[PDB]
Design a protein around this ligand. Structure first.
Ligand SMILES: [Zn+2]
Ligand SMILES: [Zn+2]
Lengths: 242, 232
C-alpha cells in the first residue's frame, strides 16, 4: 500500500499559521480529516482551501503526525454562502457537526447530510430552519441517545415539558415549567426520524425557535463532552448599526 | 451603581442560564464590572463574549441589576473555533478574578482588544500571554521585574518559584531564564501590545511564562481560580 491518499470533502475550519501554512479541517465521507498545506498562503492552494468549499486533496501521512496536503482541487462551491446570514448558518453547521461527532463517529451518511445542510443554507429561503432541521437530524447519526418517549426523570409516557437539567423532556408532574406548545412538541418528537424534506415543509414559527435552539444546546452539552464553542453561533440577536 | 435606571455597554464575560430560564451575566464595561439578570423576549440573549448594550434597573430591593433591554452591538464569530474560544474564556476568567471598582475605560479597551486578537490572529496563545501581562499593568498588581524579589538587587535573571517574579543569581536556586523569556518578563507590561505581537517567544519557552504568570497571580490576587484550570 502507500502513505499518500486521495480524499474529498468540505473545509470546515481554516487556520493561517504564523509561518504562512494553512491548517484545515475537513469533513469527508471517510471521517474527519486534519491536514496542513505548507507555505500554503503564498502558493496555488490558498483560495481552494476556504470554508465551505468541497475539495479533492492528495494527502501524505509521514511515518512519524499531521497529514500534509500535496495537491488540492476545487470540486464544488456555494458562492451564495458569502451572504452574511447564510454564512452564519453554514458556520454554525460546521462547528456544530465537528463538536457533535467524536473521532471515528463521522460516517458517510453524516457527510451526505452535512453537505445537504450547506446546500440548504445556501439555497433555501429560511436558512435558520434548514439549520434547525439538519442539526436535529444529525443527532440520529451520532453517539448521543435522543429519548422523547418517556419523562427523563420518572419514565412516564409522552412527556410534554422542558427538561432544563438534561435537555430531554419531563412530564407534567416532574416539570416546573409550562408545556412546550404543540408545534414545538411535534418537532422535538419526530425531527430525528422524519425526512428533512418533510420537515422543511413544516417550519416552526420564529417565535418558537429559541426553545428549539435551547433544547438542542442543553442536550448536546449534557450528552457529548467538550467546550461546545459552536454555541457562539446559535441565533442570539441582530447587530445594531454601522 | 449610583442611580436606579442606567444604560450600559460592554462584553459578556460570564453567562449561566438558571433552571427557571433566567440569564445571569457578568459584563465588563468602560465604567467597571456589572453583574445582572435577565428574567426569562429581549433583543439579545446576551451570549458569551458578545458586545452588548443594556438598560438595567437596580433599586434598593434587588440583589442584581435587572436587564430590561438588551441589543447586540457586535460579535466575533471566530470565537466559535474551539481553540480561540478557550483563550477567550481564559481572558474572561482572568479579568474577572484580576479586577476586584478597579476596571477602567483603558482596561475595557485592552480587554476588548484581547478578544479581537484571540479571534483574528494566527497565534492566540501569544495574544493571551501578552494581554494577560498588559492587564496586570492596568490593575493594582504589577510584577516588580526591575529588582530581586528577595533582596532587591537590580536586574535579576533567575526564576522565582515562590512568587513568580525574578530572583538574582545569589538568591536563586535555578539557572537563569533564556534571553527571550527574560526580555518578555522585563518588558511585557510596558511594551505596546503591537510591539510584543511582533516579537513572539518560541513555544518551547512559553510554559515557563505561563508558570510565572500563574504563580504571581495566585500570590497577589484574591479569589481562588477557575482561571488556573484553563491555563495551558
Ligand atoms: Zn415524570
Ligand atoms: Zn537577591
Amino acid at each position: 500500500r502507500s502513505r499518500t491518499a486521495n480524499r474529498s470533502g468540505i473545509v470546515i475550519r481554516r487556520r493561517v499559521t504564523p509561518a504562512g501554512d494553512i491548517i484545515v479541517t475537513l469533513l469527508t465521507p471517510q471521517g474527519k480529516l486534519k491536514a496542513i498545506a505548507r507555505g500554503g498562503v503564498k502558493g496555488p492552494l490558498s483560495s481552494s482551501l476556504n470554508l465551505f468549499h468541497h475539495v479533492g486533496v492528495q494527502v501524505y501521512q509521514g511515518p512519524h503526525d499531521l497529514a500534509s496536503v500535496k495537491q488540492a482541487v476545487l470540486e464544488g462551491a456555494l458562492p451564495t454562502l458569502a451572504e452574511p446570514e447564510r454564512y452564519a448558518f453554514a458556520h454554525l453547521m460546521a462547528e456544530f457537526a465537528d463538536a457533535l461527532f467524536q473521532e471515528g463517529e463521522f460516517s458517510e451518511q453524516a457527510f451526505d447530510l452535512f453537505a445537504a445542510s450547506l446546500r440548504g443554507v445556501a439555497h433555501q429561503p429560511d436558512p435558520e430552519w434548514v439549520a434547525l432541521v439538519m442539526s436535529y437530524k444529525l443527532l440520529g447519526l451520532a453517539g448521543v441517545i435522543p429519548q422523547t418517549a418517556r419523562c427523563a426523570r420518572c419514565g412516564a409516557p409522552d412527556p410534554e415539558h422542558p427538561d432544563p437539567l438534561g435537555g430531554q423532556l419531563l412530564c407534567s408532574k416532574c416539570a416546573a415549567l409550562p408545556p412546550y406548545p404543540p408545534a414545538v412538541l411535534d418537532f422535538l418528537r419526530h425531527a430525528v426520524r422524519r425526512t428533512v424534506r418533510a420537515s422543511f415543509e413544516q417550519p416552526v414559527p420564529s417565535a418558537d425557535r429559541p426553545a428549539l435552539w435551547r433544547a438542542l444546546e442543553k442536550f448536546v452539552t449534557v450528552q457529548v463532552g467538550g467546550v461546545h464553542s459552536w454555541r457562539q453561533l446559535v441565533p442570539s440577536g441582530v447587530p445594531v448599526l454601522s
